[PDB]
């Protein structure tokens, strides 16, 4: 039940310490439903990082 | 004299001077055969410049290297660099340039340190600490 989502744009650094990044993902199969999600490690564009759950957006962290 | 080229390879401080003369397939380390270079587990680092192109390239050349300075590992990298550079300088000077550019192509595509000495050197120590960047533990 995992969905794979290629990242297409690195939005910017979020989180209190700046250790997590907002990113815009695109699914490898069914190339639509582009989502903004947060990722912990360093990220370039064209990363195939996989998502355990897909139906959740992300917003700014306090 | 004869077809002789003399080169050197370098690591941090180690420098190995390679003499490449026309002769038989003689490959010696400080007057000793290459089959017993130490450490044993890193013998394939110096085996890389030989087996990558093929030993047939060494029919016409004999190599005698002199490695001094540095440490054990830095000397291993200095010898393998001296071997690779001596072979390259001989090809550049006494054989067609097609072979010299092929050798340089395989060498660069495999390991940059085979021909170009690494420029990293030890940072000097600065006062106020036991190392270059390390500082004495501070207390309040």
């Amino acid at each position: 039940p995992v969905t794979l989502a290629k990242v297409i744009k690195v939005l910017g650094r979020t989180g209190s310490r700046g250790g997590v990044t907002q990113v815009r993902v695109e699914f490898l199969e069914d190339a639509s439903r582009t989502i903004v999600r947060n990722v912990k490690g360093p990220v370039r564009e064209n990363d195939i990082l996989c998502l355990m759950e897909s139906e959740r957006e992300a917003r700014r962290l306090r | 004299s004869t077809q002789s080229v003399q080169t050197f390879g370098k690591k941090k401080t180690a420098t190995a001077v390679a003499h490449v003369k026309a002769g038989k397939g003689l490959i010696k380390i400080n007057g000793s055969p290459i089959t017993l270079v130490q450490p044993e587990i890193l013998r394939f680092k110096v085996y890389e410049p030989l087996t990558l192109v093929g030993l047939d390239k060494f029919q016409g050349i004999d190599i005698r290297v002199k490695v001094t300075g540095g440490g054990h590992v830095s000397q291993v990298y200095a010898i393998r660099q001296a071997i690779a550079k001596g072979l390259v300088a001989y090809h550049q000077k006494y054989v067609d340039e097609a072979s010299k550019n092929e050798l340089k192509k395989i060498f660069a595509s495999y390991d940059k340190t085979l021909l170009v000495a690494d420029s990293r050197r030890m940072e000097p120590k600065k006062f106020g600490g036991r190392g270059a960047r390390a500082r004495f533990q501070k207390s309040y």
Partner: protein, 206 residues
């Protein structure tokens, strides 16, 4: 394939290395493939090397670590806990013996088992902290492929170290047992317990 006779005799196996570059002139990279699309670009096994000791410059730029061989990253991560810093020749010796033991045990490709254990050991969702100046707070965030790989290597070497600490069992075969078990997905192994506990807390934090 022909044996080339030199005045300085060259052993048969290393002269056999002219055909193919193999790890320790024994293990081939040709038939090894990563069973995960997401870590192909960050586990570098495409360029074979003879010995896991290259002394390259992989700390200059940001993503230079992805170009160093994954086995060399493992032997780099092995030399930890103070007393082992700088003992790289010891780390390469231990790794070389670990691959031989992983081959002799279960009869598989040693680097296939290492690659399987690394793709299988990295947590896919980690719960980052969003604590407001001291208070306990956790938020589930995704983990980049690079951090998944190098956290897999961190947990694999930590587990082998702790299984080999104050134990007659040698480090090479503690590493061999941890890598084989994580390769086959056994929950008994460390770095698989850690991965499961990480993804469990991340499921219990989103």
């Amino acid at each position: 394939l022909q044996v080339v006779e030199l005045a300085t005799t060259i052993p048969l196996d290393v002269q056999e290395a002219q055909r193919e570059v193999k790890l320790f002139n024994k293990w081939s990279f040709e038939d090894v493939e990563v069973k995960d699309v997401s870590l192909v670009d960050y586990i570098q096994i495409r360029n074979p090397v003879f010995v896991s000791h290259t002394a390259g410059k992989y700390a200059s730029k940001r993503f230079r670590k992805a170009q160093c061989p994954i086995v060399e990253r493992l032997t780099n991560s092995l030399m930890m806990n103070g007393r082992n810093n700088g003992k790289k020749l010891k780390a390469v010796r231990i790794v070389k013996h670990a691959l031989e033991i992983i081959h002799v045990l279960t009869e598989q490709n040693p680097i296939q088992v290492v690659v399987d254990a690394i793709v299988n050991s990295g947590a896919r969702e980690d719960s980052t902290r969003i604590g407001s100046s001291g208070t306990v707070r956790r938020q589930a965030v995704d983990v980049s492929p690079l951090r998944r790989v190098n956290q897999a290597i961190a947990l694999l070497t930590i587990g082998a170290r702790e299984a080999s600490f104050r134990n007659i069992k040698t480090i090479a075969e503690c590493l061999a047992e941890e890598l084989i078990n994580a390769a086959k997905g056994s929950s008994t192994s460390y770095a698989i317990k850690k991965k499961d506990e990480l993804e469990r807390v991340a499921k219990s934090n989103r």
